[PDB]
């Protein structure tokens, strides 16, 4: 607690109404997460609404947020079409011992809008609508320039600009990095971790498409593909749906024995611990195809199979691109 400020996570005790800088009137609270906190703040000198991250009074967080202050300038630099898919900083300062961020305000997020569904999912246009855009800002991100990879890809960092548009940006580079510079071997929120974050080896921009695959399911169907308790449960999931990972991918992930188990001329097969819930079938027994249930043709939900299937690849070097997904013909008449 710094002079009373702090609560015992170092989170900032926000209080509707407070003047911050004579000119920042902090209204309510949007989210919490691991960095801190996010409130709704009303702007006095421009007359305008604003979202503001006040980042963890903690070295490490403060740390941390350099590199994300250094990425969302460094995706601001050129007047390029695709930066727009990006929620960009206004600016930062410090406000009693926390670094905080100052973001153009969005509506809601992802998750609401599911909410508003009653948790059914949206229909097949509206899921093709936010996963072009996805798509086209992953791209954005693969530029060499950039090659960030946001690892913390979700509905609740995924943001409609508009209560009666579909216009998406994404938010959140508080645990981005760029390529080779990884820097952290726990990444990405659980139910849309990568195989090869699960698995301990090295990961590119590739992850992300992992987890918006999982997104575009969940935004169809409503819920979460792969909603483990914890890593393990997480891979047995996965396998659950997608079988087992190929052994070229098994053989040097160090990871490989927390969950599957050699057999002698056999190949690999998953431990079969009591993790594994009882009505357990075996790998691919969860057909995707089932998941998904029973512009809108039955042509168009297997090219929308298709598409995510291609997302899931266990191989990151067989997982679609961004260009690659821009190109399928679940978005393209061609
Ligand atoms: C009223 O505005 C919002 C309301 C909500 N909520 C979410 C809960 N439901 C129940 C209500 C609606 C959610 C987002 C917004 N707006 C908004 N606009 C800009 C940036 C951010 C932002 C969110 N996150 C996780 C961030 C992480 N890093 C940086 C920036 C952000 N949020
Ligand atoms: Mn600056
Ligand atoms: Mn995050
Ligand atoms: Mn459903």
């Avoid at 609560?7 to 309510?28: A, C, P, T």
């Avoid at 421009?46 to 967080?61: R, S, Y």
């Avoid at 009693?96 to 992802?110: A, G, P, Q, T, W």
Wanted: charge should be positive.
């Amino acid at each position: 607690l710094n002079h009373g400020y702090d609560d015992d996570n170092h989170d900032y005790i926000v209080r509707s109404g407070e003047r911050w800088l004579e000119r920042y009137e902090i209204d309510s609270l949007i989210g919490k997460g691991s960095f801190g906190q996010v409130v709704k703040a009303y702007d006095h000198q421009t007359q305008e609404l604003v979202a503001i991250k006040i980042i963890k009074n903690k070295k490490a967080f403060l740390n941390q947020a350099q590199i994300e202050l250094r990425l969302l300038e460094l995706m601001n630099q050129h007047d390029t079409e695709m930066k727009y898919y990006i929620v960009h900083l206004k600016r930062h300062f410090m406000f009693r011992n926390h670094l905080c961020l100052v973001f153009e305000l969005l509506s809601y997020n992802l998750y609401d809008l599911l909410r508003n569904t009653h948790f059914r999912g949206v229909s097949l246009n509206l899921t093709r609508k936010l996963a072009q855009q996805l798509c086209t800002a992953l791209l954005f991100l693969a530029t060499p320039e950039l090659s960030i990879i946001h690892c913390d890809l979700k509905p609740e960092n995924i943001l409609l600009c508009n209560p009666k548009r579909s216009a998406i940006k994404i938010v959140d580079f508080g645990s981005s990095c760029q390529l080779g510079q990884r820097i952290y071997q726990y990444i990405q929120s659980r139910f849309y971790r990568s195989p090869e974050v699960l698995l301990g080896t090295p990961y590119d921009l590739a992850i992300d498409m992992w987890s918006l695959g999982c997104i575009l399911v969940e935004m169809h169907t409503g819920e979460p593909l792969f909603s483990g308790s914890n890593e393990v449960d997480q891979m047995n999931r996965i396998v659950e749906v997608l079988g087992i990972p190929p052994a070229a991918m098994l053989d040097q992930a160090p990871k490989a024995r927390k969950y599957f188990e050699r057999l002698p001329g056999g190949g690999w097969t998953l431990r079969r611990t009591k993790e594994l819930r009882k009505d357990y079938q075996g790998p691919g027994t969860r057909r995707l195809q089932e998941v998904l249930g029973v512009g809108h043709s039955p042509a168009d939900y297997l090219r929308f199979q298709d598409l995510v299937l291609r997302m899931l690849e266990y191989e990151p070097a067989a997982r679609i691109s961004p260009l690659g997904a821009l190109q399928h013909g679940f978005f393209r008449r061609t």
